[PDB]
Amino acid sequence: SGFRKMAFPSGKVEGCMVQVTCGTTTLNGLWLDDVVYCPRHVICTSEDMLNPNYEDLLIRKSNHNFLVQAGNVQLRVIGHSMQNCVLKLKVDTANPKTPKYKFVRIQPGQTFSVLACYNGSPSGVYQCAMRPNFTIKGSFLNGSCGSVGFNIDYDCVSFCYMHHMELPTGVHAGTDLEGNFYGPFVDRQTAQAAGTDTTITVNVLAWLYAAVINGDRWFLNRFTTTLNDFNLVAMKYNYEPLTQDHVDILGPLSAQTGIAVLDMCASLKELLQNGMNGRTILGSALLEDEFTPFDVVRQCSGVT
Amino acid sequence: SGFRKMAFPSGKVEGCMVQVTCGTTTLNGLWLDDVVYCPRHVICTSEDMLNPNYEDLLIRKSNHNFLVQAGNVQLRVIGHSMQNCVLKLKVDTANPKTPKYKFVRIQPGQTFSVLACYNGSPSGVYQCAMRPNFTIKGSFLNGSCGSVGFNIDYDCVSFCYMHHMELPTGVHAGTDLEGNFYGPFVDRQTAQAAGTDTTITVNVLAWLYAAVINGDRWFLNRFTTTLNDFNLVAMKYNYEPLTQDHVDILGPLSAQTGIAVLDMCASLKELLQNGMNGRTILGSALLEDEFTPFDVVRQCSGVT
């Protein structure tokens, strides 16, 4: 037992990371087969971002303006193209450590692991959720762009995030691996900011089910609520309204524990209205919303 | 910016994990050079733990009673010995992916990454602290024993923990890689339990320095305290008394930020006495104590 914010093992992604240099800008790229993917902003100087015509900037570049380093080895760039906000550099060598992989675009509320990298080398791994405002709460410094987020299924790496920028509140925005930003964000110097960050209700309920699986049951009660009644309380305290689709995906955990979803909603409603009595659930004095229902099943039963 | 509970990349340790089977017991082992390390309890049946004479149990075993599987491949055991609570199985093949490594024993308050494994295969990675009561807050199920905790320096993996058992409160106990348990715990069915878990004061202060580095400065004030005055407050709220050695290791962060250690103690003292105004530091409504001063420097500057 026990329940922790747990990332996927990073070894499969570590073997994909390379360093990309253009001009005086150095960041990370993702090397899969004979392609290296990286943020298109690598082609900007310091002052190019004011009104960047990425099309004109890339037209002025040739292959030899892109330096790719895999460990100690230079990879020769033999082609380049742009797809949305991502650059694709064709190289003359296929990555011998290419995993089976997919490019996926995730939904708000879903989770993934981040491998933070600098100089094309892995530095740390942590778990993130795509927030309802389409930011992630990352830990990223200068040179981290091109670090990726991913999930693993069996031996298949699903890449879902590439890191591009930091917003004023210290949260982060990026693209899928087709170069399309999550949310309304863009790789330009405009007055962008994260909106209000709503609590992911279905994930809080999933975490309460994790608590029940781990023997924390003090917050359960014998009285049920209605979806409408729960959502009345959810609007205050800044929780996402619970939908029938959200109730649906909590079904497997409800069946496993014997606790009806609307009974868990009644428990959560009591917790919101009356607060936690300095009390811990799974050792935390706060309600956690960065575990999906699938995350809970994986950590409690699936990993075995 | 941003600050997250961040684990080391796990790829170097993933290549060391194997499955060890003895009788009907299956768990994980650590394969380094031509040795596989695993908990000695693998030699017990279900009922052997009541009064286990590990010496007699191991004397009755031969090499062919130990099955080691690395991926799809059986490794042949050619020798066996016991060192404290760890079994060492000599195998006929040296691990081709053996990293440079050290076996280290850590102190309470220090942190490490855990690679949770089942069936000799990696499942997840997360960051832990050795608590003052010599437990860790892990996430471990049946079959996870033999999973290891580690730190990385450059290319050198410092192994510091091997997982053995779970205590009644859902926290965990284990050994260093020489088989010596952390704390008073043993691999026997006795009425063991985690004591009171004190808050790691020096780590909370380190985290407050991380907050200042990240632009959270609202909790700072212009009035200093004394070490004795701070500790008077620290005894209540269940914080470790701050020692001169603890003040010493906060020195580098104090110099970097310009905030004297006793000024940060005054800030922490105010936070404890008056509470946090539903307020966030680094996005958390709780004070975090699972980052060491070295962890903060690594995540804020060192990873670049």
Side-chain angles (χ1 to χ4, degrees):
Chain A
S1 70
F3 204 78
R4 299 291 317 277
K5 225 174 253 203
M6 185 183 291
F8 283 104
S10 56
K12 287 178 181 294
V13 177
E14 290 171 49
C16 300
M17 303 304 311
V18 299
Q19 185 185 256
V20 183
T21 300
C22 189
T24 53
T25 299
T26 293
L27 40 64
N28 309 281
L30 187 72
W31 184 23
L32 302 173
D33 292 326
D34 56 349
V35 182
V36 176
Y37 305 81
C38 74
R40 70 176 173 174
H41 205 107
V42 73
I43 73 183
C44 299
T45 54
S46 85
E47 193 62 20
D48 274 317
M49 202 161 163
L50 174 64
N51 181 24
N53 188 316
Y54 286 103
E55 291 73 19
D56 293 342
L57 291 171
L58 188 55
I59 290 167
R60 263 169 92 130
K61 300 265 172 209
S62 85
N63 289 330
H64 81 273
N65 295 130
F66 298 97
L67 280 332
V68 180
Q69 189 167 334
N72 296 307
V73 174
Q74 294 297 309
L75 302 185
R76 172 161 137 261
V77 175
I78 59 173
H80 59 279
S81 63
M82 187 166 57
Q83 177 180 14
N84 299 307
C85 299
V86 155
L87 181 63
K88 291 186 283 190
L89 306 178
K90 190 62 73 63
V91 292
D92 79 14
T93 305
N95 186 352
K97 301 194 196 108
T98 302
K100 306 295 180 60
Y101 74 91
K102 302 174 127 13
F103 288 169
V104 304
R105 187 176 179 86
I106 59 169
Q107 303 289 337
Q110 299 195 290
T111 58
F112 56 95
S113 303
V114 170
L115 180 65
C117 298
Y118 300 89
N119 317 308
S121 294
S123 303
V125 60
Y126 50 88
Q127 191 75 350
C128 283
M130 182 54 66
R131 303 306 304 182
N133 62 14
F134 296 107
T135 67
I136 70 175
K137 294 158 198 321
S139 178
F140 291 120
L141 304 167
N142 193 32
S144 61
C145 290
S147 297
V148 295
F150 63 99
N151 287 274
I152 302 186
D153 308 303
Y154 329 104
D155 57 341
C156 184
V157 181
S158 286
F159 295 104
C160 60
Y161 179 85
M162 182 160 279
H163 182 55
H164 291 244
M165 59 192 23
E166 180 176 296
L167 300 175
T169 48
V171 300
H172 301 97
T175 64
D176 61 23
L177 267 296
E178 295 194 305
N180 291 310
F181 264 92
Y182 290 97
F185 306 108
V186 294
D187 50 359
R188 299 157 189 305
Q189 309 283 112
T190 61
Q192 312 171 46
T196 287
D197 190 18
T198 321
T199 299
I200 308 160
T201 306
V202 66
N203 284 7
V204 177
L205 292 162
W207 185 75
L208 291 178
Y209 279 108
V212 170
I213 292 169
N214 277 262
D216 261 315
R217 305 174 70 101
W218 63 265
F219 50 85
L220 298 171
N221 73 84
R222 308 224 91 157
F223 309 102
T224 191
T225 186
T226 75
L227 197 55
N228 290 340
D229 278 6
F230 170 82
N231 280 329
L232 229 42
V233 184
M235 272 42 158
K236 185 213 283 162
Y237 312 88
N238 193 36
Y239 272 59
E240 286 188 323
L242 197 70
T243 67
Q244 246 309 321
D245 285 355
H246 292 149
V247 173
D248 292 337
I249 68 172
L250 291 161
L253 286 166
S254 177
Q256 186 198 150
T257 60
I259 305 303
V261 174
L262 289 177
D263 287 3
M264 197 66 90
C265 288
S267 301
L268 177 55
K269 183 190 145 263
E270 277 323 284
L271 289 171
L272 293 178
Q273 287 176 329
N274 308 134
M276 278 162 87
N277 230 39
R279 216 137 159 186
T280 46
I281 295 177
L282 287 173
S284 172
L286 308 181
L287 302 175
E288 292 298 293
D289 78 343
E290 295 221 341
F291 300 98
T292 70
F294 172 91
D295 291 347
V296 170
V297 172
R298 158 169 128 81
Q299 182 170 165
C300 292
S301 62
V303 293
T304 67
Chain B
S1 70
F3 204 78
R4 299 291 317 277
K5 225 174 253 203
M6 185 183 291
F8 283 104
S10 56
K12 287 178 181 294
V13 177
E14 290 171 49
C16 300
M17 303 304 311
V18 299
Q19 185 185 256
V20 183
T21 300
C22 189
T24 53
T25 299
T26 293
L27 40 64
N28 309 281
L30 187 72
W31 184 23
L32 302 173
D33 292 326
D34 56 349
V35 182
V36 176
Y37 305 81
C38 74
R40 70 176 173 174
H41 205 107
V42 73
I43 73 183
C44 299
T45 54
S46 85
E47 193 62 20
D48 274 317
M49 202 161 163
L50 174 64
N51 181 24
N53 188 316
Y54 286 103
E55 291 73 19
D56 293 342
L57 291 171
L58 188 55
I59 290 167
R60 263 169 92 130
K61 300 265 172 209
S62 85
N63 289 330
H64 81 273
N65 295 130
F66 298 97
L67 280 332
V68 180
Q69 189 167 334
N72 296 307
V73 174
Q74 294 297 309
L75 302 185
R76 172 161 137 261
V77 175
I78 59 173
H80 59 279
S81 63
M82 187 166 57
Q83 177 180 14
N84 299 307
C85 299
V86 155
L87 181 63
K88 291 186 283 190
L89 306 178
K90 190 62 73 63
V91 292
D92 79 14
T93 305
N95 186 352
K97 301 194 196 108
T98 302
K100 306 295 180 60
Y101 74 91
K102 302 174 127 13
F103 288 169
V104 304
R105 187 176 179 86
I106 59 169
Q107 303 289 337
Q110 299 195 290
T111 58
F112 56 95
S113 303
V114 170
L115 180 65
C117 298
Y118 300 89
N119 317 308
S121 294
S123 303
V125 60
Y126 50 88
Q127 191 75 350
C128 283
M130 182 54 66
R131 303 306 304 182
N133 62 14
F134 296 107
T135 67
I136 70 175
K137 294 158 198 321
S139 178
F140 291 120
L141 304 167
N142 193 32
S144 61
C145 290
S147 297
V148 295
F150 63 99
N151 287 274
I152 302 186
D153 308 303
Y154 329 104
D155 57 341
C156 184
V157 181
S158 286
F159 295 104
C160 60
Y161 179 85
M162 182 160 279
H163 182 55
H164 291 244
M165 59 192 23
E166 180 176 296
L167 300 175
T169 48
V171 300
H172 301 97
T175 64
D176 61 23
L177 267 296
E178 295 194 305
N180 291 310
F181 264 92
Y182 290 97
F185 306 108
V186 294
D187 50 359
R188 299 157 189 305
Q189 309 283 112
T190 61
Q192 312 171 46
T196 287
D197 190 18
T198 321
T199 299
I200 308 160
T201 306
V202 66
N203 284 7
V204 177
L205 292 162
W207 185 75
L208 291 178
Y209 279 108
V212 170
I213 292 169
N214 277 262
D216 261 315
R217 305 174 70 101
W218 63 265
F219 50 85
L220 298 171
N221 73 84
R222 308 224 91 157
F223 309 102
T224 191
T225 186
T226 75
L227 197 55
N228 290 340
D229 278 6
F230 170 82
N231 280 329
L232 229 42
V233 184
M235 272 42 158
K236 185 213 283 162
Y237 312 88
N238 193 36
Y239 272 59
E240 286 188 323
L242 197 70
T243 67
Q244 246 309 321
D245 285 355
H246 292 149
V247 173
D248 292 337
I249 68 172
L250 291 161
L253 286 166
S254 177
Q256 186 198 150
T257 60
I259 305 303
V261 174
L262 289 177
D263 287 3
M264 197 66 90
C265 288
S267 301
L268 177 55
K269 183 190 145 263
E270 277 323 284
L271 289 171
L272 293 178
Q273 287 177 329
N274 308 134
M276 278 162 87
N277 230 39
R279 216 137 159 186
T280 46
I281 295 177
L282 287 173
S284 172
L286 308 181
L287 302 175
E288 292 298 293
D289 78 343
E290 295 221 341
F291 300 98
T292 70
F294 172 91
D295 291 347
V296 170
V297 172
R298 158 169 128 81
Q299 182 170 165
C300 292
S301 62
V303 293
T304 67

